Amino acid sequence: ELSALVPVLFGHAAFQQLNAGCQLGLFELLHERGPLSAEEVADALRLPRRSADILLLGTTALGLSTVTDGGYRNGAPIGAAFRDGLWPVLRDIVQYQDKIAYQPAADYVESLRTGQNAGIRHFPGTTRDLYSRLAAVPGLEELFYRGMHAWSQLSNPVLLAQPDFTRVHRVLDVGGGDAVNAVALARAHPSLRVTVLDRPGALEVARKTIAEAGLEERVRTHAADIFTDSYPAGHDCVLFAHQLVIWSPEQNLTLLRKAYDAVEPGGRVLVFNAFTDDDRTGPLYAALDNVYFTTLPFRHSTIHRWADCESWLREAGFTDVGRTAPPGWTPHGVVSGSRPR
Amino acid sequence: ELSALVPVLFGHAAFQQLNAGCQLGLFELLHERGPLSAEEVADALRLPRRSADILLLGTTALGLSTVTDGGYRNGAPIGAAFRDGLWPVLRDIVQYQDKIAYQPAADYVESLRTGQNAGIRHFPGTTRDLYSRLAAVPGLEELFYRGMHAWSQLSNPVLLAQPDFTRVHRVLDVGGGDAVNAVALARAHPSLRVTVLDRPGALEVARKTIAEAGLEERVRTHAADIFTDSYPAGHDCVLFAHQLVIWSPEQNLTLLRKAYDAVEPGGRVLVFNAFTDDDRTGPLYAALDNVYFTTLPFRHSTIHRWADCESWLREAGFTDVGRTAPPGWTPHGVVSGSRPR
């Protein structure tokens, strides 16, 4: 039946409702002061009455809000997010979709046809990857990492629960960004020490992330190019978090070989990101999130299958290669290998 | 729970997958030559293999396609559209979303906050309505009406099944666009004669629609401004198809009172468009489609509730006012009235 096509055919509109609910302060208002009538919403949020009605209709029909009494409350997924302490995280990733993902997504068809990340044209600069363009605009880098920080807060529980971090001590965070994951690791495991490797632009945000955690003595930054520069020696654990999704399989092989050469024998390699199921049918998250990867970061970015990643670890020379999957939310998992002695 | 938020959070990406499947010719390919391997798709569609994989994961995960065999076929909603002869309709409304709706949708938050159709900025010009701006870009007016045509072909069976058309003979099509509905009515009812009222630019497309149905002697075009000019006298029936959703309630009143003055006493008024449920909870189609009306056509545009429409008819002076809401056809219906003798 073709009624089924309506939510896809209007998917962008569906997103815009969540976008508006967040940006316009609806969900937080309902959280602190619900239930509220449409006219109370309009007055609170300073919206024209027609505007509140349209918004409330949008969020109510999607299940983001519920209406009884002619009074409005947050719906179950929203209320759930508040309950679990995940609202600022949810709010921030929505901002990201809005400010970073949405408009480049329009270049999806061209990006597929030409194999280019055509969506990057919306950002000043001439380099062919998104990250080296973040520096081109004042405050852009900070906005981007506010986003990434939040995505990792959402997905790094599976990382933090990784058995290896009770057994390793010195982690190399390759492309560690704003050091969100270094810090989360350092906090959960006081034994641990982490080197955050990234572009200088990222590391300026990293220092601030490190400084407000007071983790300057166990978490440090090091500026390098992940391809052309050497990975710092004397590390126990090489971590790739939301990294290998950016590059082609051959580039990934290159990165993993550097991980191998640099890591202490008996050490571990960890690949942490979303993964496409090996049967290529999902999950929905990877399937959808790939529109971002096809249009923006780099021309070969895509969410790879577990089996493909595992293959790269073995062909880099790692052993004991395997995966850690379920939490629930999402396809985030860890693929891991050991450097043999 | 927040897994639920995923299709909304990536709502724009879901649409883009559908968008790509249409534009790149995937669904048509699968229809005539499925089942196919990923690599067969890649070669046929002239896509890089990595592109074919990313696309196929998206459509498969969405159910737009299915994978068994390791061979790909159209999923149920897509195949159903082909079987029912609705494929070109689906194709054209997807093209309309892509070229007309998707980017102005980003101006939703701003549109809500200011009560303006802020999305109109994506179109060259300075007038306050979308329709008078279409001529500024070559082929835009026709591309637009190609889009309107396809939407009406999808929803006007409820209109064609409206009982009044066995009791009326001369219908006035107020804001009749490319005459998709005038022609469809004339076909369904050989008794009928229709006057299509619209801007000259629209009527140029209307003439063509009329000519290729060969209905030039029963369906004619008349250039007028629906607000500042009088409606032609001597009509049995005044029809508003996808029209009142554009204007404010005060404006809808002005238009309906004009219909009142122009229609023969004992004549009928028909308002045909999508409707919002009186309980303001849905349907989803109306709730989402509002993103387009808030951002693009005009500063007051919105999908009104049945009851609000009914109320305007009665206050314009019509009697016997009621609704027709065929099951399966939601959110499309007709609100109708009579001019008293």
Ligand SMILES: Nc1ncnc2c1ncn2[C@@H]1O[C@H](CSCC[C@H](N)C(=O)O)[C@@H](O)[C@H]1O
């Ligand atoms: N050539 C390069 N040298 C250094 N860092 C690079 C790089 N190419 C990409 N990166 C970094 O790779 C990161 C991708 S985003 C992931 C950031 C962080 N690990 C997290 O999980 O939240 C960005 O910080 C980008 O600056």
Ligand SMILES: Nc1ncnc2c1ncn2[C@@H]1O[C@H](CSCC[C@H](N)C(=O)O)[C@@H](O)[C@H]1O
């Ligand atoms: N001031 C005006 N005068 C005449 N036509 C107008 C108008 N403002 C809007 N319209 C027309 O209103 C229509 C809105 S779209 C509806 C088209 C047609 N009724 C259909 O159902 O397919 C457009 O054709 C637009 O040109």
